[PDB]
RNA sequence: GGAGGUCAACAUCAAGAACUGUGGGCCUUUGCCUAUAGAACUUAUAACGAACAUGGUUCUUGCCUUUUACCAGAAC
């Protein structure tokens, strides 16, 4: 098996630059559960909360534009549409609510989940919604007629994170039974199963280019090729548990938010971890409240936005000095698995 | 009549359509000392022009 | 003063929420023992305040509307004021109505400034046939 | 015999039942068209900021300092 | 009723009866009006029973 | 209507009948999502084996820590792995913040006196007396120190 | 503040900028709608067809003696504008503004009115002319 | 109403906050707390 | 490789058509003469010898359409064709991670009787008290003298 | 072949003050410019109806133990 270990010593992967802390934005009353960014102009955020609201923050200066109320309970997920001026928010109240960005009033309510719905993802080309939650089923909603067109029977437990892809498998799903399924929706059954995770897969992210996915677990962040469904790579992780979210820059940088408050940055190609940071909790907070609930990159990918459990949004910027003087991180030493 | 929350002595009575008049900035502009009272300014004016 | 206006209003709300069904004469008795307190203490001042007049009206009309719910109705025709205001010795509730009067309405925009006087009267409380009813503040001598 | 729950109902069950066909109130067609993007003083006795917590904040002690009288 | 118009429903051109009469199961005739009133009362009473 | 009445009269009422959250059953759901959310974490911190016994046990420790937070009692457990205590402190801090904010909101909804239910007045009263005594004990301790 | 203190912008935001009614995503209006302020025809192909051949009219402009400027003035509701209506709809062959109603009209077609405010106000406000050739 | 309320004039206001400032000083903040928020000051002068 | 372009214009086409088939299949089902405005022999049987022609029958509008649709509940089987191998890559740990029992003052629903010590401060005063008591003491003496 | 019908089907009926076809030129089909022919029905105190109902969501209220049923304004 050593031949593989030599083949890990030839590459010397992929230098990148570190990250640092540009800006701190308070202003939520409760926790920040979810964050999404305007896919076109990059001019703002939509941030869920634990206070039921949604507060639309300006990306440029960080000022607060507007407040979108209307959920009775905490908002687990928010997703903004590309081709549409629509905003689909979803909560623990068992409802997926549409939002017309133009006039800022609820348009449609989609009905028929048994219990809280923790993920919405907007299929790129079909005018569909994909919702999922403690139902343990994935519902493909027809955006126009509010008809739960397709239901995907599936994982043996709740469904944490769901994504959409234009070609085959059009829905990737991740559940607390510690599997990740690659779905074929037209026939309505699993195309491929990926079991390699040992515990709940709490987050996924789609690489904007290579047509792959990064899947998470407690201590091990893996990657997966879509299409064939192979494993692609691994990412070197000592115990980071727990991984709340992942985000993939367009430069092939793979972010990992910790529940220990550590921000684990990776290269996507290699699996190498070139940086790990630690956030400052807050003025009056508790050391338990330091963690990262969600995160995203803008359309460019030169800034990072992380909602934290301390009731604050933080904006992490990529250092411009860097280069070879001293960037170098942990420097690519891998222990035998 | 409706939008301005006014009635013609024989016309209908509606709701305000802008329920809050309560906000008033204390300011010199409309102060009595600066106003000349000629003619009462009946409603029928306010509905007319 | 505004505070003790709000204290009175809050107390009426107290009588209302406290008694789900106490029957009837208990309610009229409580409201009597409240109002008589308010007047007897505030006697002279009450004349000059718009909000406390409005709140007396809403208060009494609200309690009458509570006995009306006590059967089923809001209906005006069923309950002419003889029903409420005849003393117990004749078999009526015997409540003491201070809310009829007429309420000075003058000039919302100006009365913020001059104290124009009383230029107009809004109708305080209503009826099918008017009759009239005496109101407490007439039967209690002013403080001066 | 009240219990927490230790599970949820998997929607798979409801997926195998047959539809009833009752017509609800909120599923009547509405918003049917999408939208696309493009000397007196001398006698006196005496001479002359964000905390994160709910209870210890300032607004709170204002609140309870008032509504308790 | 002047302030909130309606602007009804193109494609409404299909009516209950124009769809209904088509079928085998409905037949057309004339009749006295009061007789139609009485029949319809008998209809209803059987329905609710 | 009669469409539903009759089709329901032949075909029986729908078997699914999911039921939405509204004003009455809200708090129940909030509890439920919470206890679930703690189940996940405290299952994912532990190294491998044990589940159901330690499930019930740990969730009991949750409830107890909440009650002791209402009572201002500090809730020290003579022993318990510290990271779990981090987690439970976190979630009960959350629930605490939401609870307080509901107390303020309902109060300033009552001061205006618009459509508050007969009970919400009583409940809100309760939450306010709890919070007020907490402010008191805080003041006294900080006077000692 | 001090936990960061140097580069980091510590900002506590409440209330709002951008009052909530604002669109937050601007509706794209591709065509430009004038019909709110005035009522005025913008295309080259919809201008009425002037049975007298406009081209031949513009030739008259070379002869200074030939063209004349007449204004029309008179007190309220003397019929000015509805007179210019008679002249116009005599000259032009097909006007898009005629409803079948006003063509036989119970309600006078008022061509030179042209402003929304002057339509609803029932009056004429800003002066408006026309140019046309007509046979003596 | 505004007219018969207390007028706001520099002499007046400055007198008011002056008085309240001194008596504010006399009592120690330890015994009690006298805040300008709760207080009311009235001034009768040539202009009021 | 990302999935080209003319590849997605296919999956989008066929999927889009299929979803339209489901939606239109539904809108004609339910009870609304209103909802229908938003919307072949085909049988070679056996050897095709006798062919076939299929023709629908118009239902009597009053009588129930779908005479057999009646709400009833079904348990579905799970037909397991193949097994998905679940392929993954303490000792002293329990002494860290062992959860104690949960015992509350407030509730003993079962009736478990447990010792009183399962049911059942450091800092001293400040020198301020010393100073204050001494000042009042002395000034008191002075005044009295 | 004319008159009709308490007959049917299929089109069309709210918009750059606005429809469609065609000829010619430029870009490279779209689109812009230019030339020409025909425009039923509905529209300016704006609309197919010289009339006038109900429902859903979201806010503001009003009744006021709670839910249907409701009170009267707004937006979609
Ligand atoms: N009987 C009668 N009435 C007319 C005649 N001409 C116009 N009117 C009425 O008089 C009113 C005035 O007609 P307009 O020409 O539209 O009004 P106008 O001349 O523009 O009045 P101004 O706006 O002041 O210029 C209209 O409402 C017409 O109904 C007419 O020849 N005979
Ligand atoms: Mg004119
Ligand atoms: Mg109940």
């Amino acid at each position: 098996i050593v031949n593989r270990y030599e083949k890990l010593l030839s590459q010397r992967p992929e230098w990148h630059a570190p990250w640092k802390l540009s800006r701190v934005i308070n202003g939520h009353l409760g926790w920040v559960r979810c964050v999404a960014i305007d896919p076109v102009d990059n001019e703002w955020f939509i941030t869920g909360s634990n206070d039921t609201t949604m507060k639309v923050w300006d990306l440029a200066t960080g000022k607060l534009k507007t407040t979108l109320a209307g959920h009775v309970m905490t908002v687990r997920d928010v997703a903004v549409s590309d081709r549409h001026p629509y905003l689909f928010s979803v909560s623990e109240d068992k409802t997926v609510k549409c939002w017309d960005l133009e006039k800022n009033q609820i348009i449609r309510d989609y009905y028929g989940h048994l219990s809280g719905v923790r993920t919405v993802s907007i299929h790129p080309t079909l005018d569909l919604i994909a919702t999922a939650g403690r139902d343990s089923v994935i519902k493909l909603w027809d955006m126009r007629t509010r008809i739960p067109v397709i239901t995907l029977v599936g994982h043996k437990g709740p469904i944490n994170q769901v994504q959409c892809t234009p070609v085959d498998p059009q829905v990737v799903s991740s559940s607390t039974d510690a599997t990740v399924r690659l779905w074929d929706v037209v026939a309505g059954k699993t195309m491929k199963v990926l079991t390699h995770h040992k515990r709940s897969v709490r987050a996924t992210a789609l690489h904007p280019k290579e047509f792959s996915v990064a899947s998470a677990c407690t201590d091990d962040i893996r990657s997966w090729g879509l299409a064939e469904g192979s494993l692609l790579t691994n990412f070197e992780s000592e115990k980071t548990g727990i991984i709340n979210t992942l985000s993939i820059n367009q430069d092939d940088v793979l972010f990992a938010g910790g529940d220990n408050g550590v921000l684990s940055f990776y290269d996507y190609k290699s699996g190498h971890k070139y940086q790990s940071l630690a956030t400052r909790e807050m003025v009056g907070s508790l050391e338990g409240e330091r963690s990262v609930l969600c995160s995203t990159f803008d359309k460019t990918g030169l800034r990072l936005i992380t909602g934290e459990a301390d009731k604050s949004i933080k904006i992490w910027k990529q250092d411009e000095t860097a280069t070879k003087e001293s960037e170098p991180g942990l420097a690519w030493n891998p222990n035998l698995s | 009549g409706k939008a301005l929350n006014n009635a013609i002595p024989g016309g209908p009575k509606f709701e305000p359509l802008y329920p809050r008049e309560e906000e008033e900035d204390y300011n010199e502009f409309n102060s009595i000392d600066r106003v000349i009272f000629r003619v009462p300014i009946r409603s029928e004016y306010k509905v007319a022009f | 003063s505004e505070e003790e206006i709000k204290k009175f209003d809050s107390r009426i709300r107290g009588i209302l929420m406290a008694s789900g069904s106490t029957t009837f004469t208990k309610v009229a008795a409580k409201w009597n023992t409240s109002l008589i307190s308010l007047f007897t203490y505030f006697r002279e001042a009450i004349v000059a305040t718009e909000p406390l007049l409005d709140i007396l009206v809403k208060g009494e009309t609200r309690i009458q509307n509570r006995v009306k719910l006590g059967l089923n109705s809001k209906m005006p025709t069923r309950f002419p004021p003889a029903v409420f205001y005849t003393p117990k010795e004749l078999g009526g509730l015997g409540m003491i109505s201070a809310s009829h009067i007429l309420i000075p309405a003058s000039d919302l925009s100006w009365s913020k400034q001059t104290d124009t006087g009383i230029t107009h009267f809004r109708a305080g409380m209503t009826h099918e046939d008017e009759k009239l009813i005496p109101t407490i503040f007439r039967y209690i001598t002013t403080w001066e | 015999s009240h219990r927490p729950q230790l599970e949820a109902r998997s929607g798979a069950k409801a997926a195998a039942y047959t539809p009833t066909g009752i017509e609800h109130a909120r599923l009547l067609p509405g918003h049917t068209t999408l939208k696309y993007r493009k000397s007196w003083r001398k006698g006196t006795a005496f001479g002359r900021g964000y905390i994160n917590d709910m209870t210890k904040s300032e607004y709170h002690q204002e609140f309870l300092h008032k509504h308790v009288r | 009723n002047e302030l909130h118009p309606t602007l009804p429903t193109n494609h409404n051109k299909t009516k209950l009866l124009k769809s209904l009469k088509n079928t085998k199961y409905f037949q057309q005739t004339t009749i006295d009006w009061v007789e139609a009133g009485l029949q319809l009362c008998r209809q209803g009473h059987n329905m609710l029973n | 209507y009669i469409g539903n009445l009759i089709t329901r009269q032949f075909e029986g009422r729908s078997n699914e009948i999911v039921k939405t959250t509204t004003k009455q059953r809200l708090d129940a759901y909030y509890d439920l999502e919470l206890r679930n959310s703690v189940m996940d974490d405290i299952l994912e911190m532990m190294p491998e084996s044990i589940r159901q016994k330690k499930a019930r046990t740990i969730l009991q420790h949750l409830s107890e820590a909440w009650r002791c937070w209402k009572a201002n009692i500090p809730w020290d457990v003579p022993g318990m792995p510290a990271p779990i205590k981090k987690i439970i402190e976190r979630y009960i801090k959350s629930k605490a913040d939401a609870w307080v904010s509901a107390a303020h909101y309902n109060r300033e909804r009552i001061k205006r006196g618009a459509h508050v239910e007969k009970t919400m007045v009583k409940k809100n009263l309760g939450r306010l007396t709890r919070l007020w005594i907490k402010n008191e004990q805080e003041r006294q301790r900080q006077i000692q120190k | 503040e001090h936990p960061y203190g140097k580069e980091v912008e510590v900002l506590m935001e409440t209330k709002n900028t951008q009052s909530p009614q604002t669109p937050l995503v601007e509706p794209v209006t591709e065509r430009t709608k004038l019909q709110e302020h005035t009522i005025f025809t913008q295309l080259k192909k919809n201008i009425p067809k002037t049975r007298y051949n406009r081209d031949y009219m513009l030739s008259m402009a070379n002869i200074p003696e030939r063209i004349i400027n007449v204004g029309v003035i008179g007190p309220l509701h003397s019929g000015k504008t509805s007179l210019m209506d008679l002249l116009v709809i005599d000259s032009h062959k097909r006007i898009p503004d005629m409803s079948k109603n006003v063509e036989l009209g119970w309600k006078p077609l008022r061509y030179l009115d042209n402003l929304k405010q002057e339509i609803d106000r029932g009056l004429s406000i800003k002066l408006n002319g026309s140019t046309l050739l007509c046979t003596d | 109403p505004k007219d018969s309320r207390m007028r706001l004039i520099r002499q007046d206001v400055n007198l008011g906050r002056a008085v309240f400032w001194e008596i504010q000083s006399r009592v120690p903040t330890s015994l009690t707390s006298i805040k300008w928020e709760n207080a009311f000051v009235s001034v009768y002068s040539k202009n009021n | 490789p990302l999935p080209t372009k003319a590849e997605i214009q296919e999956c989008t086409a066929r999927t889009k058509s299929y979803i339209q088939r489901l939606v239109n299949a539904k809108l004609a089902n339910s009870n609304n003469r209103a909802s229908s405005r938003y919307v072949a022999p085909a049988n070679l049987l056996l050897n095709n010898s006798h062919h076939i022609e299929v023709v629908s029958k118009q239902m009597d509008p009053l009588l129930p359409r779908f005479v057999g649709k009646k709400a009833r509940k079904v348990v579905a089987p799970t037909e397991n064709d193949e097994v998905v191998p679940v392929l993954h890559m303490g000792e002293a740990d329990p002494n860290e991670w062992k959860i104690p029992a949960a015992v509350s003052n407030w509730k003993n629903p079962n009736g478990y009787t447990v010792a009183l010590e399962r049911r059942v401060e450091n800092n001293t005063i400040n020198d301020g008290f010393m100073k204050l008591s001494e000042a009042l003491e002395n000034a008191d003496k002075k005044a009295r003298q």
Side-chain angles (χ1 to χ4, degrees), chain C residues 110-115, chain H residues 1-5 40:
Chain C
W110 292 351
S111 296
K112 307 297 283 185
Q113 294 172 334
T114 295
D115 74 16
Chain H
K2 294 178 182 179
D3 171 67
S4 67
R5 187 182 298 176
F40 290 95

Side-chain angles (χ1 to χ4, degrees), chain A residues 183-194:
Chain A
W183 289 96
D184 182 6
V185 297
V186 175
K189 63 183 178 181
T190 295
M191 173 174 169
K192 179 64 173 174
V193 180
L194 305 173

Side-chain angles (χ1 to χ4, degrees), chain G residues 31-35 38-46 49 94 96-102 107 110 116 119-120:
Chain G
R31 292 181 176 85
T32 60
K33 293 178 181 294
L34 273 63
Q35 190 172 359
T38 63
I39 173 172
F40 178 76
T41 68
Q42 296 171 327
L43 279 88
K44 294 293 181 64
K45 61 183 292 180
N46 293 132
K49 302 303 286 186
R94 177 66 173 85
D97 295 351
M98 288 182 180
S99 63
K100 178 181 170 60
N101 187 26
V102 299
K107 274 196 223 183
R110 269 125 45 63
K116 190 72 179 296
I119 286 171
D120 290 345

Side-chain angles (χ1 to χ4, degrees), chain C residues 13 17, chain D residues 63, chain F residues 22-27 98-111 113-129:
Chain C
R13 183 182 299 178
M17 296 294 182
Chain D
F63 177 85
Chain F
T22 61
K23 183 58 164 61
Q24 73 177 24
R25 68 177 67 84
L26 186 144
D27 62 11
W99 184 83
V100 174
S101 65
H104 299 293
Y105 173 75
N106 285 333
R107 192 64 180 174
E108 295 178 354
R109 185 177 181 83
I110 289 176
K111 291 181 68 66
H115 185 278
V116 65
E117 297 177 353
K118 172 58 167 60
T119 60
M120 295 304 297
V121 174
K122 188 183 298 297
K123 296 167 63 182
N124 183 31
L125 185 147
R127 294 182 179 175
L128 283 176
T129 183

Side-chain angles (χ1 to χ4, degrees), chain G residues 2 5 28 35 47 59-60 63-64 66 70 78 81-82 87-88 92 95 99 123 125 128-131 133-134:
Chain G
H2 182 59
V28 176
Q35 190 172 359
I47 297 170
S59 175
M60 295 296 180
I63 298 99
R66 263 222 173 162
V70 55
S78 58
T81 305
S82 66
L87 291 170
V88 172
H92 299 162
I95 292 98
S99 63
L123 182 59
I125 295 171
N128 188 342
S130 177
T131 67
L133 70 77
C134 47

Side-chain angles (χ1 to χ4, degrees), chain A residues 31 50 72-74 92-94 111-114 118 134 199-200 202 218 241-242 287-289 291 311, chain F residues 18-21 26 29-30 32-33 36 40-41 43-48 86 89-91 93-94 97:
Chain A
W31 291 0
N50 201 32
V72 297
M73 293 177 68
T74 191
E92 290 293 325
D93 63 11
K94 304 173 177 177
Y111 166 80
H113 281 280
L114 297 173
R118 290 180 296 183
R134 302 175 69 247
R199 289 180 184 170
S200 175
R202 189 175 292 181
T218 59
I242 301 169
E287 185 175 3
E289 291 179 349
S291 65
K311 303 170 183 177
Chain F
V18 314
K19 53 181 66 179
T20 187
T21 179
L26 186 144
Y29 291 152
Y30 178 80
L32 194 144
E33 71 168 340
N36 187 29
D40 289 344
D41 292 346
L43 287 181
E44 295 176 352
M45 290 300 295
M46 295 177 183
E48 52 180 342
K86 307 301 284 187
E89 290 305 327
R90 191 175 71 193
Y91 286 91
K93 175 61 174 171
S94 174
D97 297 349

Side-chain angles (χ1 to χ4, degrees), chain G residues 1-47:
Chain G
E1 187 268 329
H2 182 59
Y4 309 128
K6 301 296 178 64
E7 294 184 352
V8 180
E9 301 175 352
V10 175
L11 55 82
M12 176 69 180
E13 292 303 322
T14 60
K15 297 183 176 73
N16 295 132
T17 62
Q18 187 173 353
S19 65
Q21 185 174 354
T22 60
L24 186 147
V25 168
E26 182 179 2
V28 176
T29 57
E30 190 279 336
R31 292 181 176 85
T32 60
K33 293 178 181 294
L34 273 63
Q35 190 172 359
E36 184 279 335
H37 174 54
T38 63
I39 173 172
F40 178 76
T41 68
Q42 296 171 327
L43 279 88
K44 294 293 181 64
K45 61 183 292 180
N46 293 132
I47 297 170

